[PDB]
Amino acid sequence: PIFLNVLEAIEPGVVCAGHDNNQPDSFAALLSSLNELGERQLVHVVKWAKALPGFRNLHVDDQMAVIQYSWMGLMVFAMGWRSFTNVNSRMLYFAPDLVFNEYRMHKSRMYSQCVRMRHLSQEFGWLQITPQEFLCMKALLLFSIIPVDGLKNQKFFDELRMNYIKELDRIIACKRKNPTSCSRRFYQLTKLLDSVQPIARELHQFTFDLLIKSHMVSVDFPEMMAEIISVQVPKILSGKVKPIYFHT
Ligand SMILES: C[C@]12CCC(=O)C[C@@H]1CC[C@@H]1[C@@H]2CC[C@]2(C)[C@@H](O)CC[C@@H]12
Ligand SMILES: O=C(O)Cc1cc(I)c(Oc2ccc(O)c(I)c2)c(I)c1
Ligand SMILES: O=C(O)Cc1cc(I)c(Oc2ccc(O)c(I)c2)c(I)c1
């Protein structure tokens, strides 16, 4: 129906990192390219978000707020999916020009986090996630993290988030023959969605600490990334902004 046509239409295409693969895989270069890629994906996330049904109706400050708090989860999720469809989750497919193998995972100094990310990617397979479910789940990640003291207009946010969860229901209910399977599916997908948060939090910690010592380890942070990671990420790391979990 209408909802799905929109999600499929506004889905971003391929985004390159600009990484020079003809150079050695050093920590400095890898992370600098990961950051450039982050900067680049940020642009598409803003456009994608503002193309989502009802998003433009949220207060403007809240629009920027939710994007600034949820981009990590959004990009990690999309990446995991790309990884599943492109290389069957055998490697982290950040970008066509930035695929991480075992060696790069280690060189990046975030090996265990990459492992968590590959596990997430694999879930798409174990759970046989359909493209429709991926799209609706991803739209939901945009509405999955807010400040403890609420947004400028929490009411509208809670209403919009509810409607997106409803859409996810339709998508689940539009296939499952029996009723015990839908309840089960919803449980599986909400668990999957929650599982994204812990991974995002770890990357939040990592990039934050990395920005602090960026000058000493020669890692470049583009403008947007540097401001968001020094202004927004810290609100998450200090507990002022928290994720919305379905389960305990
Ligand atoms: C979101 C990105 C870039 C977009 C993507 O495909 C997922 C990936 C997950 C790791 C992030 C990276 C952006 C730059 C970060 C934040 C580095 O500073 C450390 C963790 C990196
Ligand atoms: O499935 C469908 O019919 C499509 C659909 C999808 C959504 I998300 C939805 O939610 C709102 C709520 C407030 C608002 O201002 C806007 I714009 C949209 C509605 I209403 C309909
Ligand atoms: O695409 C559009 O609508 C135009 C547009 C694009 C961008 I990028 C933008 O600025 C930022 C920069 C970083 C960031 O995290 C956020 I949130 C917003 C603005 I304001 C408007």
From Swiss-Prot:
GO terms for cellular component: chromatin; cytoplasm; cytosol; nuclear speck; nucleoplasm; nucleus; plasma membrane; protein-containing complex. There is a cross-link at residues 175, 177 (Glycyl lysine isopeptide (Lys-Gly) (interchain with G-Cter in ubiquitin)). Ubiquitinated. Deubiquitinated by USP26. 'Lys-6' and 'Lys-27'-linked polyubiquitination by RNF6 modulates AR transcriptional activity and specificity. Changing residue 71 to L: Strongly decreased transcription activation in the presence of androgen. The record marks 227 as: Interaction with coactivator FXXLF and FXXFY motifs. It comes from the Eukaryota. The modification Phosphotyrosine is found at residue 245. Changing residue 50 to E: In prostate cancer; found in bone metastases. Residues 1-229 form the NR LBD domain. Signal peptide: none annotated. Changing residue 80 to D: In AIS; loss of androgen binding. The record marks 50 as: Interaction with coactivator LXXL and FXXFY motifs. Changing residue 60 to M: In prostate cancer; increases transcription activation. Changing residue 93 to C: In PAIS and prostate cancer; partial loss of androgen binding. Changing residue 73 to V: In PAIS and AIS. Coiled coil: none annotated. Changing residue 128 to E: In PAIS, AIS and prostate cancer; reduced transcription activation. Composed of three domains: a modulating N-terminal domain, a DNA-binding domain and a C-terminal ligand-binding domain. In the presence of bound steroid the ligand-binding domain interacts with the N-terminal modulating domain, and thereby activates AR transcription factor activity. Agonist binding is required for dimerization and binding to target DNA. The transcription factor activity of the complex formed by ligand-activated AR and DNA is modulated by interactions with coactivator and corepressor proteins. Binds DNA as a homodimer. Part of a ternary complex containing AR, EFCAB6/DJBP and PARK7. Interacts with HIPK3 and NR0B2 in the presence of androgen. The ligand binding domain interacts with KAT7/HBO1 in the presence of dihydrotestosterone. Interacts with EFCAB6/DJBP, PQBP1, RANBP9, RBAK, SPDEF, SRA1, TGFB1I1 and RREB1. Interacts with ZMIZ1/ZIMP10 and ZMIZ2/ZMIP7 which both enhance its transactivation activity. Interacts with SLC30A9 and RAD54L2/ARIP4. Interacts with MACROD1 (via macro domain). Belongs to the nuclear hormone receptor family. NR3 subfamily. This is Androgen receptor. It comes from Homo sapiens. The gene is AR. The chain holds residues 672 to 919 of 920 of the full protein.
